[PDB]
Amino acid sequence: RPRFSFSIAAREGKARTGTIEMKRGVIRTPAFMPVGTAATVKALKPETVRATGADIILGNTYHLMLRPGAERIAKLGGLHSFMGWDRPILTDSGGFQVMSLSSLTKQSEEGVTFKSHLDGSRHMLSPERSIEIQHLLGSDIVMAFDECTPYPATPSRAASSMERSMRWAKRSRDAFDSRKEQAENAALFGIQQGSVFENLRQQSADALAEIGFDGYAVGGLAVGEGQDEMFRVLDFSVPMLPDDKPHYLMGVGKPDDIVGAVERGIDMFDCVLPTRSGRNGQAFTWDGPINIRNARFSEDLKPLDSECHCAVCQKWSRAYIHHLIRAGEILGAMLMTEHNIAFYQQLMQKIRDSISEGRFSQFAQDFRARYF
Amino acid sequence: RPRFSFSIAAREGKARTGTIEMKRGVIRTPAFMPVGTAATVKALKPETVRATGADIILGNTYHLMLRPGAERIAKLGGLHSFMGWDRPILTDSGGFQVMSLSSLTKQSEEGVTFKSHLDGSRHMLSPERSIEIQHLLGSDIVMAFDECTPYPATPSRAASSMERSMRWAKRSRDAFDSRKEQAENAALFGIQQGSVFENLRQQSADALAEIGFDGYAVGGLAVGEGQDEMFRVLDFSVPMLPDDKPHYLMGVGKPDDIVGAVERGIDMFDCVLPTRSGRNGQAFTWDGPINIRNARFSEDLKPLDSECHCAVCQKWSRAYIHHLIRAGEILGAMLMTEHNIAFYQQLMQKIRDSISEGRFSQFAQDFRARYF
Numbered sequence A, B: 001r002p003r004f005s006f007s008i009a010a011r012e013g014k015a016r017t018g019t020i021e022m023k024r025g026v027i028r029t030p031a032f033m034p035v036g037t038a039a040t041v042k043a044l045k046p047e048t049v050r051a052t053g054a055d056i057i058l059g060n061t062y063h064l065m066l067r068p069g070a071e072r073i074a075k076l077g078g079l080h081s082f083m084g085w086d087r088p089i090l091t092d093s094g095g096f097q098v099m100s101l102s103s104l105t106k107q108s109e110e111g112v113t114f115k116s117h118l119d120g121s122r123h124m125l126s127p128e129r130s131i132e133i134q135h136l137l138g139s140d141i142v143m144a145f146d147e148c149t150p151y152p153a154t155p156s157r158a159a160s161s162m163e164r165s166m167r168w169a170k171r172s173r174d175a176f177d178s179r180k181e182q183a184e185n186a187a188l189f190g191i192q193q194g195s196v197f198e199n200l201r202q203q204s205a206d207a208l209a210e211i212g213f214d215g216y217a218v219g220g221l222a223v224g225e226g227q228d229e230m231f232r233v234l235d236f237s238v239p240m241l242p243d244d245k246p247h248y249l250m251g252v253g254k255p256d257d258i259v260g261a262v263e264r265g266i267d268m269f270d271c272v273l274p275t276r277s278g279r280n281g282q283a284f285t286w287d288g289p290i291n292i293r294n295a296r297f298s299e300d301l302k303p304l305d306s307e308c309h310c311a312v313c314q315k316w317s318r319a320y321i322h323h324l325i326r327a328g329e330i331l332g333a334m335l336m337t338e339h340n341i342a343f344y345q346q347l348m349q350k351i352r353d354s355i356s357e358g359r360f361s362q363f364a365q366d367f368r369a370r371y372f
């Protein structure tokens, strides 16, 4: 396979379906990427993640650089070897997590300095260090280092942040290109910023296209603006990005959000919703999510979802999983997580098929009618 | 297969190897039974438990009667269906846990009354209720309800407890036999008591044989007397039990303890050591246990154990598992537990093979030399 090749096989309105070919494997789009926070997709062996249908997973740079550490992972052979996942891995730049998980952060045009939330160590993340860490991890899809804009944001602040992000996009591109091994085996995605302002989104899109990237992400959304507003911004923002490259909506994972985003041209997604929901006890079903801890499921012999083809729904009852979660058993988390990730992958598969068959619109309608 | 059939294929000194045939499957002896506390073997799917080589698992009656509840499990189809394990399951009588986990216990000749450690509910366990609960769970090997003797124990108290236990053994036998379905499909094991006193162990053994059981367990050991003393008691106690029936040493699981117990005629074992050790971070190896959290393993690329054939040692490094455990990741527990249970099963397999080949003595010697 090539270093990177995105091909669109079918379209319906703004929706697209196709594949991204990379050295470590093929990625079917629209794609949902399970999140592997600390070199592990919570409660699942990599083979199980693959069994659900995942083609690629996401790795958090912020978390990994803190522990076990980027250099350490490199010395151990890279992230793939370390965690046992041999297919593509997309790594975020770490910027977002730094501004929401660490403390005593010091921002400047050079980058950001912060103290770990684990202990009291300091770090100086920048476009160059972020790209370097992603190289050390052996990431397949590298994200440019940006400065995220909090919501709500004033035009002035959003412009300043977006402008700095574009300068950082150029620095990220050059850093990536200067490292022969990385430039020849990995791909680089740029991130569009600009908050909810159309003119800023346009300037960002133009700056990113001018530099040139393998893929373009829509950053700065799903940060508190609500679906209505998010959809409104996607309406004019996605068309601004190069049509022949993947469109990645970062941090978006609610089923309905995904369907709406695909309807607006998005090709890639990632979110902890699936996995985290395996904590409180939320299980996704085509009839909407259910909280398995609820007493009504204590003697329910049916599977989590009546149609789901995952191993969990083939072998265990809601009653059993209900018991497991209420008892705080690890198997409870393992089963809930496997089911939720499988559910998301089945959602993506139904989306890909409907688009390829020119019936995505009807699928979106039918999906919403039953899910709500 | 028959309801119950124990056959000894080979012997070496007091050691024996063979099989127990039951409706749900064949059990190779000496056997180690993973413990499924709350209807789950901590952090493992039943298929994974089977993959390690386990032929049978143990279920805790005390825990199950508290939650989800015996009657509820019965209504849901039995424990096997509930948790997804279709092979034999041995259930303890619950007596031991009641005297070590619950509170405000009230003991009498009728049974014991206690309050759950989960909430403040009350329960009245007795020989009849214990047998009934084990029936409701659908247990294959039912344990008689006894009164365990704390260590150390005076001759007088040990005799009184042993005497009450034998009266309870008779009540357990009659309860079991009165329930046609259970008597025709399950097996009943009696439990020898008597603390560390030879004369009491003899009286207990005689009383149990007089009543007649499918198997005989040596209870009251591994409660603080130390291996030396435990071995001394086993020396004279095991020979007192019927030679043609299985000998079960309850609550014994340290590798060396198992080897020594088999050398003294024990055929079955169970202990949480394997699973619990997957918490603190203790991994078993032929060179002795190691604490994976130790800094020396941070960049160790070797598997947990150099010879182990388990899936964990085939795919992940000590370095990775070290990271997982120190990060509190669920996958850490899953991998450590799978490895430890696999290790125990490999230990049992090496024991069975060496006995069948008349070289168990040499194996015990070689095992100890390297393990210590």
Ligand SMILES: NCc1c[nH]c2nc(N)[nH]c(=O)c12
Binding pocket: A092, A093, A094, A095, A096, A143, A146, A148, A191, A218, A219, A220, A221, A222, A223, A250, A251, A252
């Ligand atoms: N939903 C926004 C978001 C999630 N993760 C992100 N990571 C980066 N670098 N930038 C972003 O805007 C985001």
Ligand SMILES: NCc1c[nH]c2nc(N)[nH]c(=O)c12
Binding pocket: B092, B093, B094, B095, B096, B143, B146, B148, B191, B218, B219, B220, B221, B222, B223, B250, B251, B252
């Ligand atoms: N190691 C002693 C022991 C563990 N579990 C037990 N359960 C019962 N009923 N009796 C016992 O003596 C024991």
Ligand SMILES: [Zn+2]
Binding pocket: A304, A305, A308, A309, A310, A311, A312, A313, A339, A340, A342, A343
């Ligand atoms: Zn499912």
Ligand SMILES: [Zn+2]
Binding pocket: B304, B305, B308, B309, B310, B311, B312, B313, B339, B340, B342, B343
């Ligand atoms: Zn192993």
